[PDB]
Amino acid sequence: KKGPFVDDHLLKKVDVQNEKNTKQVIKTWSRRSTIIPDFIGHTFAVHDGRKHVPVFVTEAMVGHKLGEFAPTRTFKGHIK
Amino acid sequence: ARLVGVDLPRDKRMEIALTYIYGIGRTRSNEILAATGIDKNMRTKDLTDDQVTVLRDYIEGNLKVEGDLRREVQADIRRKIEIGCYQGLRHRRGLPVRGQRTKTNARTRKGPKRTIA
Amino acid sequence: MPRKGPAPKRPLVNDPVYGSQLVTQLVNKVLLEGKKSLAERIVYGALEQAREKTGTDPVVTLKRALDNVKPALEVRSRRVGGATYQVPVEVRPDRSTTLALRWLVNFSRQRREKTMVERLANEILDASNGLGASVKRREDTHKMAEANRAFAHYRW
Amino acid sequence: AKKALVHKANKKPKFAVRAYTRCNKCGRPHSVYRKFGLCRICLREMAHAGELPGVQKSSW
């Protein structure tokens, strides 16, 4: 666990977002970490592929990464 | 004998008594018995109450034990659900957490093989 | 190579410790497929354990047990006219010896002693005296081969 | 095995992990080795032709 992901474009976007103290739904393509705690309060519209599904960032949100915080595996598999 | 709450059977070696516990396993049985000073071969019947107290203090202070392993495993499980992680989603759908086989295998999670119509 | 005549067989040497063909065949039958030296040690210790519990030569005790287990008539699985008619056939000495030792090993591994060394020793004793599973199976097979003599004249 | 996909794998990737084999002679990306860098179906056909200096039938 040398270094988790930094979300470089999402990192710059979040820095610009929270430096102005403005909360915006970032249409975040990045899906490979929420390891950085500064993401709290930013409505990450996770681009699961079909759309940008919002996900909120919490304190205990660390330790697992950003992707299927909004699920992408739409599944019913039984009659629906 | 007396311990944290997991029985140590009458015909199990001391490491073997430990291995039953969720808190202590065979390798941790060896580690704890080396750190404390109890033989891995001696029985539960040959155990001393002072050694019981010393062992309990050592395991509760330097090892994740029944309570510590629960407050670790389940708390971090619900932690990875509450972050929306697909490790949490493997937990929810009764799947192995590391994304290994869920299609047919992984019965200990989803539950044994069955039969639909 | 059936359908062409008798099948050649691998020859068997005697035991180094004991020196008997029956002992070595018993070793190879108790031989869990994959290990021999450990199986040899197990059959050894079983034979010495039979020795002190009998006071005689383990090879002679094993011979007595095999005689008390060796069958004389075998029943095949020929289908005659869509009905299972059992045709007893006289057993050659090698086939009867193999059957006796196979039964001895199968009922040895069945026993519930601490080790299959002890289990095999107890099986040897219970076959030598005549109070084991192998002896009662030897009795039962002869009883069943005699109960169906009406089909014994087919001569196959 | 589209020619576009062949040029795509031949074009530079923006990540060090996007690189894969994509055997160039035919276009099959799977089951491509290092010592030869080809697919199995073309490997057998080249090998049976004898143009490869050294490969032959194995029989021991």
Added chain:
Amino acid sequence: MSVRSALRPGVLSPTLPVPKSIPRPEYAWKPTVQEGSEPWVQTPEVIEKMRVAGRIAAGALAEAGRAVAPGVTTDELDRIAHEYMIDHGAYPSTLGYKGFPKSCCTSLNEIICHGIPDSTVIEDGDIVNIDVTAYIDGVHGDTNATFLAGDVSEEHRLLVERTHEATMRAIKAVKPGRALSVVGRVIEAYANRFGYNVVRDFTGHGIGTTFHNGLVVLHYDQPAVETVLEPGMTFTIEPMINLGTLDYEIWDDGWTVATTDGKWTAQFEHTLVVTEDGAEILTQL
């Protein structure tokens, strides 16, 4: 108390076999025979065969319900009911029906209906609907009833009992010369007093020589339906009352359903035949 967690389709046990003594649909035979369906016209012979089949189904349902205890698996209920109704010479019409692998249908709490018995166990404070059906001599008899397993809290007791009053209120509202939809309307009325809701999809179905004859009895106010009752129709009233809204989460066990809102629900199915002056229950003990 602590609210029960969401159910998951536990390991489904094997199927309960059925002696051919009791017949089966034509699928069993050559697929080009198409001898199913039968003259659904309800003759009095088929009425008596229906009485027998419904009594058998009700007895098996009672056996399953008396088997219901905290710690008793729904599989045990299905086994006991199947033993009772096979001993009575009846075929489980739900076994293999469109892919249902069990003799009886066990709905648990949130499950709407046609739930699949599996390794899921019943505990204290639960509500369990058991659905039993019997087939003989070309008749189909289905009925489900919900029971309070353990010392259940007040709210779920109200839920189940209200489903039950909606049940016999729809049953008693059945009169000759009345439209079908009034039944559903009555149910909705009883749902409106306590603010409960009724699913508009899994509703009453006509029953007879075929399990589903196509006669669907909607359990809500549907003025667009002019289906008038005449004596002789055997059909199931199974009003469905939830603790939540009309959206639901079909259990991953499909047949088995569940309420999206994780709020518990109840179901009571009674098969009725219209007499010269009202309704008569043929699946009653």
Added chain:
Amino acid sequence: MGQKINPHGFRLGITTEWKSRWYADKQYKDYVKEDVAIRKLLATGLERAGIADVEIERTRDRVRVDIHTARPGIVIGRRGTEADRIRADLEKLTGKQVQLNILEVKNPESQAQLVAQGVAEQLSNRVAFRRAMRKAIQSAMRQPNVKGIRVQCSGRLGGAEMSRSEFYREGRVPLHTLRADIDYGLYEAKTTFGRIGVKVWIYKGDIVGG
């Protein structure tokens, strides 16, 4: 079909020799790519003239390319007009100085690949398949010391929708026998209606060659 192992793919270490021969340490893949590129470059124009073989040997990294053709004059026309142009093209394409070697087959069509070439050209020439066969088959055996032949064809023969096949055998052609020296030649004509594959097996004799 029947698992007929390639006679050149089966007796490549017994009777027949490899087209290419060299040694390369941690250099095999690039040599294979160079061989493939050179053979692709010499594919259509050479086969139209009647090319027979293409050997690519490697001297001390400079060049060794030999092309065995069945007719002189087309590959090498006016001195420098054709041979030097393709030599310069090879020099440009391959990162080496190419001293291209062009040699002529001593006899008329006598190779399995050459027979397949002639047969496929005739089939594309709208002639009677049978004629084409027999004709080119007669023009096949040839091979002075010839002992056996096996002419096979498959595909849309004559442009029909059915992928019919023909088999003709002459004399000893033991495929199974390893002292066979059976040359293999496969060529596919591209007809207006599709493709026709042509197989030729040429059994020179029973010589072991060991």
Added chain:
RNA sequence: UCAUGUUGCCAGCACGUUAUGGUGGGGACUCGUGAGAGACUGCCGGGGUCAACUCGGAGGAAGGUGGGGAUGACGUCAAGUCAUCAUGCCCCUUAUGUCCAGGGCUUCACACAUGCUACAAUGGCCGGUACAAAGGGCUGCGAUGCCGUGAGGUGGAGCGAAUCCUUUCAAAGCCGGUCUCAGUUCGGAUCGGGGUCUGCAACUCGACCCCGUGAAGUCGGAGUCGCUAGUAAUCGCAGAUCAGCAACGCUG
């Protein structure tokens, strides 16, 4: 059998003195492979048509085609492959073209198939004893030493290599102690913490490590498969696609 002594083995010899052919030398022996010999009923006896063939004996390492492989005549089943490839034909040519973002392709309430693990004391835990070959290795083996519970980190020798790493190549086995026939020190699931590495990033979406996990399964029902000797079977090692591995796989 001849040749063959280097990187390799080391009797006949010395030097190591620990690190083992390891070193100088040693062809003597494998080893290493170039050549060759040596199974061809080669000899004999017996039936048999006096024939094949067969049986048996003998020489022979191989015996009655030595053994293991490599041999696909004619054709067989529109089996499969326009997604290996071209390919006749049809369709789009501004899209079904086309690059990239993200996802899925790993999804699961299941059916089947195949395997590893078991279900133990023949074994589990702990420790010691001695033997494999093929290999594979230049940005790869990568060692010694160490921090490390252990991943993993350094780190680069000898290494394009019979030299050096893979250990002077194992495991099962041998022994000793325990465990005492049990949901077991079986058995591993199962997941959690924290990390550890690769990877831009390991939630889907790698693996590993320290710990803990101790389920089912107490040897399998109908029914079924394989195996004629190095065979069934057990154990371990290696190689390929592999930056990270789904591999309990495949090839040996």
Added chain:
RNA sequence: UGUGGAUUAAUUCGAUGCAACGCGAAGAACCUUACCUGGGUUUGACAUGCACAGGACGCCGGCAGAGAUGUCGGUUCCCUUGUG
């Protein structure tokens, strides 16, 4: 692990006893992608032939942008006079 059944944007495609299902797949976080959602290119990501301008293209950077892509910053031809 793969296949069938079901979801899905895709759960890529085909193979369906022998001769499919530890398969092509001897290797799916991007890639693999063939599928979908969305954003770009449109003689197109990729080419060939006719030109037509041409001395630029093209490269080294910055920025925006999920990225494709676009902006320009700086170099600006090498032939040899026909123009390539």
